[PDB]
UniProtKB/Swiss-Prot annotation, chain A:
Protein name: Small ribosomal subunit protein uS4
Annotated GO biological process: cytoplasmic translation; DNA-templated transcription termination; maintenance of translational fidelity; negative regulation of translational initiation; response to antibiotic; ribosomal small subunit assembly; ribosomal small subunit biogenesis; transcription antitermination
Gene Ontology terms for molecular function: mRNA 5'-UTR binding; mRNA regulatory element binding translation repressor activity; rRNA binding; structural constituent of ribosome
Ranges of residues in domain S4 RNA-binding: 95-155
GO cellular component terms attached to this protein's record: cytoplasm; cytosol; cytosolic small ribosomal subunit; small ribosomal subunit
From Swiss-Prot, chain B:
Summary of the function given for this chain in its UniProt record: Binds directly to 16S ribosomal RNA.
NCBIfam families: S20 (TIGR00029)
GO terms assigned for molecular function: ornithine decarboxylase inhibitor activity; small ribosomal subunit rRNA binding; structural constituent of ribosome
Keyword field: Ribonucleoprotein, Ribosomal protein, RNA-binding, rRNA-binding
Leader peptide range in chain numbering: none
Protein known as: Small ribosomal subunit protein bS20
Cited PANTHER family: 30S RIBOSOMAL PROTEIN S20, SMALL RIBOSOMAL SUBUNIT PROTEIN BS20C
Source superkingdom: Bacteria
Pfam assignment, any one: Ribosomal_S20p
GO biological process: cytoplasmic translation; ribosomal small subunit assembly
Record's keyword annotation contains RNA-binding: yes
One GO term describing the cellular component: small ribosomal subunit
Curated annotation (Swiss-Prot), chain C:
Full-sequence portion shown in this chain: 412 to 578 of 744
Name of protein: GTP pyrophosphokinase
Originating gene: relA
Cysteines engaged in disulfide bonds, as pairs: none
Role noted for this protein: In eubacteria ppGpp (guanosine 3'-diphosphate 5'-diphosphate) is a mediator of the stringent response which coordinates a variety of cellular activities in response to changes in nutritional abundance. This enzyme catalyzes the formation of pppGpp which is then hydrolyzed to form ppGpp. The second messengers ppGpp and c-di-GMP together control biofilm formation in response to translational stress; ppGpp represses biofilm formation while c-di-GMP induces it.
Summary of the knockout phenotype: A slight increase in biofilm formation in a csrA-disrupted background; when combined with a spoT disruption (a ppGpp0 mutant) there is a very large increase in biofilm formation. The ppGpp0 mutant makes decreased levels of CsrA and its inhibitory small RNAs (sRNA) CsrB and CsrC. Deletion of relA alone decreases persister cell formation in a hipA7 mutant; the double relA/spoT deletion obviates persister cell formation.
Length: 205, 85, 167
RNA sequence: GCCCGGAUAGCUCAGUCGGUAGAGCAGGGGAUUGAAAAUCCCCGUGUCCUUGGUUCGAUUCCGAGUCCGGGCACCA
RNA sequence: AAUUGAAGAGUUUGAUCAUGGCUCAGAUUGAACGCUGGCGGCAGGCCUAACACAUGCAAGUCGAACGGUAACAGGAAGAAGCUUGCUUCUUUGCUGACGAGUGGCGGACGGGUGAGUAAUGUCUGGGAAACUGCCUGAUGGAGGGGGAUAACUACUGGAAACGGUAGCUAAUACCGCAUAACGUCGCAAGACCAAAGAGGGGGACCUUCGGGCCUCUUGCCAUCGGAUGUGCCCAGAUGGGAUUAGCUAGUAGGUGGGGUAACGGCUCACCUAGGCGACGAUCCCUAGCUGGUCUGAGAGGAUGACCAGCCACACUGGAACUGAGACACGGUCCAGACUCCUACGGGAGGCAGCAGUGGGGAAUAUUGCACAAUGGGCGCAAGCCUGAUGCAGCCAUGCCGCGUGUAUGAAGAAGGCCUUCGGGUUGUAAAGUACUUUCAGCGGGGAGGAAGGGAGUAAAGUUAAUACCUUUGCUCAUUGACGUUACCCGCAGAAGAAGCACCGGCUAACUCCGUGCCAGCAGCCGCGGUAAUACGGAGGGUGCAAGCGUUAAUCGGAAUUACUGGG
């Protein structure tokens, strides 16, 4: 799992950004994004529709760094679920524990959030958890397990959260090193630059 | 095959002999009956049965023959004698 | 048997029987080191006494495993094994060989017995089936057969054409 | 296990009677056409198993050792 | 609140629309191979040879049915040994319990395999002519005798296997007689059949002082049912073949005897000449069936390995036996083949039980651990057996999860690479600086799976009884294969951890050089003859990720078998 390649390279490919280069050197740019993801990257191929949609899904996966398989599982899970499966999917990926950590901003990327997770730094409700994929149920209280709390990285992290966004559906505590996931994020909320439906049909094939 | 559990086998023979003897004995009287039946003399026939009865039912109770069968002989036979006697 | 014997390190017991004898090895099917049974694959060490079970003769044991360097290593009896498989096919080959031999033997040089006369004292005859076996095994150039068979050396007449070949 | 012989240019294969390794295969190229066909012209081509000794000549004597096909010693 | 699900592309032509085949994009697997490979949990794991098999173990238990005691340990004796009263040794079942035996229960379960079987099978739903150990409800019984036999003596056959002869003895083994009814036969009247005790404790009396007797417990016998399992019958469903069209004489039906637990051509005798068949008889090939599994939006198609029912088979063919039940996987007997013993006269053997071995194959593992948990067999119970089972080993084999780091980092390093030789690029990538510390690693701590059972005691039922005993509490000593357990703790340290395919169209993604119809690639179209984005290599990328590809097979797309849904 975990792509772990040049974190930024993907933003160069997708023509967008995964915000992996959070705030300090700030705006990516210092990378020459899009200009040439690989070798003769200056080219802008027609990109047949299968390609634009494939690129769409890749884009999303890359964002949350999820592997194709587990991602598909999420897809299918979203399929059986009520509601236009499309946005239901986002309801799934946002529920990502690690991703919640990024939302709660204890990390600065998704990767950082994983490392926090794998290293048990974040207990939830009344238990430490290491499965970054631990789906986070509504009204789920969760915080950094104090034994590893106050690692300066989280300090600077929350400080970097100011210039982030502060997602509304969630209930971050910030000061006391805590966060509480309320209701599942509505489609209208997050990014919206992506057209999840694109991924939906992507598996129509 | 050899096992102490195989003892069953020999003990089974120690039964068959005894068991088989009884069966023959049973059938034996029955023979007499039919013989007397074929003889056509109801008195001796009836009697032949008169003694064939206790033994066959006894075998039934002994568990040698599933009771019902003993009755089957008794019935069809009585039907035979009454048919003639 | 309590008898002792040197062995190339790590050789399979399947090889072992051959050190005892080739034939016992063909019929070899079992071995129980320290009484405990083990496959052929168990390489020997520590001079452990090796109980060996066998059978009759029909085999091709590790001859079904020769191609992988897996089971029955070495080459001594190993080659001997191939030999057995070989003698079987050899007889088969011999029959087929006999056929093809007659072919050449009559198509060119003429008279198969004379070809044996063109064989009895040509290549290591020993027997004659020896001369009748190689025919199917390709064990004899499969060309010189014509050359021995064509032992004739007239000469002068060829010069009349050698003088012409030079023309 | 004893022991025994067969081991050739890139192929098939001459010679391997102790004496300057070459014949057929295609081949690659030449001349032809955009290429072939058709067709003309040319031959390129090695450590004789690799290697030591008796040899002026060893690829034809005698070994290692391997190879390949044998006969037998090989039953605990 | 209990499905929201359905994409197309290439390919015939100078070109077009048709039609229309081939092929492709997905999912799928008991997979195999190649490459590569770190951990965890979960499943999976011989599909071919239902081929052969060394060893081990895979089914035993009850002394509370019994005569006994070969053994293990206590008691009765004496001599002796000698720590002279301190121990060692010699006879008997007396006890504790216990080899062999008699005997009851089990061995028909559980486990395996899918050969056979196209229907004596299964599924479905029906039906009546049945039976049914252990268990349970009810009704009663349970008296009185006898003949044995192994064991075990003694002699004896044989290499062995396995016996033989003559005597010794018991019982819940066995067999009479009595006794039986809402049992059987019978219209009835009538006839007839049942068995067994064992153990525990105990006041009085009885005392042949071996016990009687009393109470408790459980066993035993007949009948009645209940539950359960098993047998049977019919309809419908249950592969392909018509270049298989007729088949059939116990065949179809009847009557009568016989037959089994029961119906019945189940079987015989005689009588009738029918019976099945185009809504496929019969014959031929193939197959275990279903619940389901796979695919599909569905309808369908494919399949039926794991888990589960059912059925069939257990070296091959055959027959019975005991028994409630088998025509019996580790029972018998016969024959056959094949291994093996053999003193050759004559015997022994059956892993398609778990492991395992040889073999076959592309291919599928340990000759492990514990009966601790569940269940099963025996037994009052304690217990004993348990390759069912619970586990652990093995293998990326599939599913899922996680890790191989994180942040920052412009000199846009070097080096490789391409260049229109300016530069772009590789590439924040690395280094560097700074932080965390999953699993690894080592070291600490530490569950749950455990319920029971035992010992004790108290109470209640109990009866003559504060006995035994049943039940119910309560106390105490205990029961863990997995197992350096799950999980939690600590320590150290970026430390130990990324590969595989493709990159012409299909189809995500490029260049450079190498080669020149050669070498080569290919699923289809097709690439390659000097400037290959397709071949080989380098670079860069694309996709997926401890996996990636190929082959394998199935549905898909295929509305190219079309009911849905074509002509």
């Amino acid at each position: 799992a975990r792509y772990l390649g040049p974190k930024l390279k993907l933003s160069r490919r997708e023509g967008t950004d995964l915000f992996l280069k959070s705030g300090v050197r700030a705006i990516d740019t210092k990378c020459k994004i899009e200009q040439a993801p690989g070798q003769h990257g200056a080219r802008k191929p027609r990109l047949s529709d299968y390609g634009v949609q494939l690129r769409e899904k890749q884009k999303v996966r890359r964002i949350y760094g999820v592997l194709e398989r587990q991602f598909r599982n999420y897809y299918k899970e979203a399929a059986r679920l009520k509601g236009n499966t499309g946005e239901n999917l986002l309801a799934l990926l946002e529920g990502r524990l690690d991703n919640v950590v990024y939302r709660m901003g204890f990390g600065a990327t998704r990767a950082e959030a994983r490392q926090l997770v794998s290293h048990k730094a974040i207990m939830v409700n009344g238990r430490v958890v290491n499965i970054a994929s631990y789906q986070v149920s509504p009204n789920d209280v969760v915080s950094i397990r104090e034994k590893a709390k106050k690692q300066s990285r989280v300090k600077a992290a929350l400080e970097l959260a100011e210039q982030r966004e502060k997602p509304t559906w969630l209930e971050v505590d910030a000061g006391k090193m805590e966060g509480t996931f309320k209701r599942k994020p509505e489609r209208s909320d997050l990014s919206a630059d992506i057209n999840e439906h694109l991924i939906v049909e992507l598996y129509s094939k | 095959n050899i096992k102490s559990a195989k003892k069953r086998a020999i003990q089974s023979e120690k039964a068959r002999k005894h068991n088989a003897s009884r069966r023959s004995m049973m059938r034996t009287f029955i023979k007499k009956v039919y013989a007397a039946i074929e003889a056509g003399d109801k008195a001796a026939a009836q009697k032949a049965f008169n003694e064939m009865q206790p033994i066959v039912d006894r075998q039934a109770a002994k568990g040698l023959i599933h009771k019902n069968k003993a009755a089957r002989h008794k019935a069809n036979l009585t039907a035979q004698i009454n048919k003639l006697a | 048997k309590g008898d002792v014997v040197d062995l190339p390190a790590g050789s399979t017991p399947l090889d072992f029987a051959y050190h005892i004898h080739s034939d016992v090895g063909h019929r070899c099917i079992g071995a129980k080191i320290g009484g405990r049974i083990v496959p052929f694959t168990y390489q020997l060490q520590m001079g452990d006494q090796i109980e060996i079970i066998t059978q009759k003769q029909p085999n091709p044991s590790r001859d079904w495993l020769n191609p992988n360097l897996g089971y029955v290593t070495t080459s001594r009896g190993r080659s001997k094994i191939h030999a057995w498989f070989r003698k079987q096919d050899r007889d088969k080959n011999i029959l087929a060989g006999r056929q093809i031999l007659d072919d050449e033997l009559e198509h060119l040089g003429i008279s198969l017995k004379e070809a044996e006369k063109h064989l009895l004292p040509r290549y290591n005859f020993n027997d004659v089936d020896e001369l009748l076996a190689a025919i199917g095994g390709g064990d004899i150039r499969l060309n010189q057969m014509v050359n021995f068979l064509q032992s004739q050396f007239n000469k002068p007449s060829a010069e009349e054409q050698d003088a012409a070949a030079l023309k």
